[PDB]
Design a protein around this ligand. Structure first.
Ligand SMILES: OC[C@H]1O[C@H](O[C@H]2[C@H](O)[C@@H](O)[C@@H](O)O[C@@H]2CO)[C@H](O)[C@@H](O)[C@@H]1O
Length: 453
């Protein structure tokens, strides 16, 4: 409410360093700033966004924000040109949706190969030598590589290496009908990983926590993680280097590059309080450093502080894997891409389906669920569950998109409920709700539009 900014950020980031920026904002303003890191906040936000229980500011990679923006869930970001010139232009590209800036870019993230120099002074240049490397390391009682296999964010670089892609980009924007998840490149990539499991070089149940504790206790020679993981490795007794990810079939693995961004809730009563903290407190040299001290940000978007961080060879390696990778689209159809790839990798890793059944299933489901967003606002009110039931698409990854779209539609009805009570609300979500509620909603919609002038 008024007199407080509640901020949502994921738990693997420096929320205590971010809180320290919230203290300094309170010493000058008296305004209290609370930072919390809820479980599944990226899925919890579309549930409580337009309600009085949503955050004022939400921190996540830029790929989740276009679904928020298209729903009208976030207020438009309009900094002065003098403030925009303080950040790199490509960071603003990642937060521009339909010509509108929708968030504040914070830092550039990219996965890197992190290795123990004591167990491995020269890291492998190719994926293909980890099998032979692991055998020599399992004789030593250890393993070669352990990383999170439960999230496709970590496994996508190998899948993308030989030619996999999410949505084909061609001349200005992406084609959601062109998904490259089961092409010859993505199959060879996922086959190599599955080959590592069946050959006893990796465990299919390895997650983030096990892979981190194994590397930080010297049990595996390598892991794959981002800049946020460096702080936990510093505290342990391992001398580590970070460098390029291995190549596959002679081509560099292409990770999905995420730009950590801060979006402002369109239903927040303290939008101006949020921009002042963001523009004049966090996005400063001493604000970024308070967070980077907690757990590192990576290549920050602030050009002044990025001069100091570019010295770090760990930052240079992050940028090298980011140029070899590709930036994530911010389109709402990314949620459909992820949900379908998570199931394909887990099913192929556990052997429940072959690499071919897994990647062909995800290809059709990701291309089918992508079209649901094109009619999310068209389906008339009270009819979304009826619409879903009629289609009969009973696939887990497709209905995960149906549920989120249903969550998006509910928040637009909350925005209309507040807007009718002269409360803070996003006008785009108000109109999106009104334009699916019959002829009287379209009269109330346009009548409103005509008084705005
Ligand atoms: O897994 C940790 C890592 O996850 C994030 O990457 C996400 C992506 O941003 C989401 O849209 C999700 O659907 O897909 C990926 C997970 O599979 C962040 O990019 C990163 O900061 C975070 O550490």
């Amino acid at each position: 409410e008024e007199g407080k900014l509640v901020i949502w950020i994921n738990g693997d980031k420096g929320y205590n360093g971010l809180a320290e920026v919230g203290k300094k904002f309170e010493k000058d303003t008296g305004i209290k700033v609370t930072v919390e890191h809820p479980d599944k906040l990226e899925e919890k936000f579309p549930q409580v966004a337009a309600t009085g229980d949503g955050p004022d500011i939400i921190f996540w990679a830029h790929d989740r924000f276009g679904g928020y923006a298209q729903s009208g869930l976030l207020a438009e970001i309009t900094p002065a040109a003098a403030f925009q010139d303080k950040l790199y232009p490509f960071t603003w590209d990642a937060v521009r949706y339909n010509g509108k800036l929708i968030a504040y870019p914070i830092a550039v993230e990219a996965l890197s190969l992190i290795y123990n120099k004591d167990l491995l002074p020269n890291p492998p240049k190719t994926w293909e030598e980890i099998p032979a490397l692991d055998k020599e390391l399992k004789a030593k009682g250890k393993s070669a590589l352990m990383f999170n296999l439960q999230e496709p964010y970590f496994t996508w670089p190998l899948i993308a290496a030989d030619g996999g892609y999410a949505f084909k980009y061609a001349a200005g924007k992406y084609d959601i009908k062109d998904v490259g998840v089961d092409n010859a490149g993505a199959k060879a990539g996922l086959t190599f990983l599955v080959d590592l499991i069946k050959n006893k070089h990796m465990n299919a149940d390895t997650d983030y926590s096990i892979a981190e504790a194994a590397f930080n206790k010297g049990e595996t020679a390598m892991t794959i993680n981002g800049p946020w993981a460096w702080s936990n490795i510093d505290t342990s007794a391992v001398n580590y280097g970070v460098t390029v990810l291995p190549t596959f079939k002679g081509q560099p693995s292409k990770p999905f590059v995420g730009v950590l961004s801060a979006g402002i809730n369109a239903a927040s009563p303290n939008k101006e309080l949020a921009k002042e903290f963001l523009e004049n407190y966090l996005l400063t040299d001493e604000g970024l450093e308070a967070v980077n001290k907690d757990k590192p940000l990576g290549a920050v978007a602030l050009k002044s502080y990025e001069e100091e961080l570019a010295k770090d060879p760990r930052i240079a390696a992050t940028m090298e894997n980011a140029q070899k990778g590709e930036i994530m689209p911010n389109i709402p159809q990314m949620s459909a891409f992820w949900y379908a790839v998570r199931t394909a990798v887990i099913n192929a890793a556990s052997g429940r389906q072959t690499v071919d059944a897994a990647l062909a299933a995800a290809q059709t489901n990701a291309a089918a669920a992508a079209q649901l967003y094109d009619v999310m606002d068209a389906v008339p009110a009270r009819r979304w569950k009826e619409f879903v039931r009629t289609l009969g698409l009973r696939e887990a990854e497709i209905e995960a998109v149906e549920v989120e779209i249903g969550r998006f539609r509910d928040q637009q009805y909350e925005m209309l409920k507040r807007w009718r009570q002269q409360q803070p609300a996003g006008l785009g979500a108000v109109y999106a709700a009104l334009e699916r509620m019959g002829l009287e909603g379209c009269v109330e919609d346009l009548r409103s539009r005509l008084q705005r002038l």
